[PDB]
Design a binder for this molecule. Sequence first.
Ligand SMILES: Nc1ncnc2c1ncn2[C@@H]1O[C@H](CSCC[C@H](N)C(=O)O)[C@@H](O)[C@H]1O
Ligand SMILES: NS(=O)(=O)c1ccc2c(c1)CNCC2
Length: 261
Amino acid sequence: AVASAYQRFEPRAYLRNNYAPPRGDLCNPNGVGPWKLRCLAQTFATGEVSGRTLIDIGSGPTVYQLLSACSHFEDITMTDFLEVNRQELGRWLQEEPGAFNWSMYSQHACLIEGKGECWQDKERQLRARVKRVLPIDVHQPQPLGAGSPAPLPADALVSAFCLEAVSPDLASFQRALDHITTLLRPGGHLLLIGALEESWYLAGEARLTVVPVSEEEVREALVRSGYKVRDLRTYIMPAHLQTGVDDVKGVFFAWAQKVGL
Ligand SMILES: Nc1ncnc2c1ncn2[C@@H]1O[C@H](CSCC[C@H](N)C(=O)O)[C@@H](O)[C@H]1O
Ligand SMILES: NS(=O)(=O)c1ccc2c(c1)CNCC2
C-alpha cells in the first residue's frame, strides 16, 4: 500500500528536495549530480547501448536520466504511476508555464559528452524523441500496459529511484524487477539507478517507506532476473549532501544485459 502514501506525493517538493541545491548544484565535480550524469554518459558513449525504442520507468517529474540517452534512441517513452508527475513532465515537454528548470543538468550533460553541443539543442532533441508519457505500475505483471502504445519489446530500459521506492521489501523489489524486465527485448540493455540503504524519503506531505538495499542485493537481484551485470558502481553520499529529506547512504548505478540464451 505504498501507493496510498504516493497519493500525497508532491512533485515540486520532490524536485526541490533532490534536484535543487545542494544536491542540484552541478558546479562541484564531487556531487551526485555530476556522478549520475557521468555514469549515464560513459555508458552510452561505449556505443553498445543502442536501438530504436527505449522506456523510462517511473520517470517521476524528472528528465535528467534521458539526457545522454536521447542521442541513441529515436522513440522514447516516459512513464509514471502518478498522474501528477506525468503532468509535471508535460509542462517541461511542451514548455508550459511553471515547468521545472533542467538547464544545469542539460548543460553538464553537454560538458561530459564533449560534442560541443549546446544545452538548448539537447533539450530540443530530447523533447523531440519523447513520444508519450504513459501511466505504469511495476507491481502488475504486465506494467499497467494491457495494450500500450509503447513499442514492445523496447530495445532498452532506464529506471532511476523507482523500484526500491515502490516496493516494501526485498521480494516486492525482486518481483517488480521481473515485471519490467519482460518489457525488455532479449539482448537488451538496462540502466538502473537507485538509493542505497534508504528506508524513507519525503516528498511534501508524502512520507514514503522504502526498502534499504545494498549493492550486493541489487547485483543478486539483477542476476536472478536474468541479466549479466555489465557494470555496477556506487557513490557514497557526502555529509554536505545528507539533508533531512531522507536517509540515503549512497546511490548506485547498474548497467545490465537481458541475457538472451
Ligand atoms: N507502482 C508503481 N510503479 C511504478 N512507479 C511507481 C509506482 N508507485 C509509485 N511510483 C512512482 O515512483 C516514482 C518514485 S521517485 C522516482 C525518481 C525519478 N525517476 C527520479 O529520477 O528522480 C514516482 O514518480 C512515483 O509516482
Ligand atoms: N541526491 S540525488 O540527486 O542523488 C537523489 C535523487 C533521487 C532520490 C534521492 C536522491 C534519495 N531518495 C529517493 C529519491
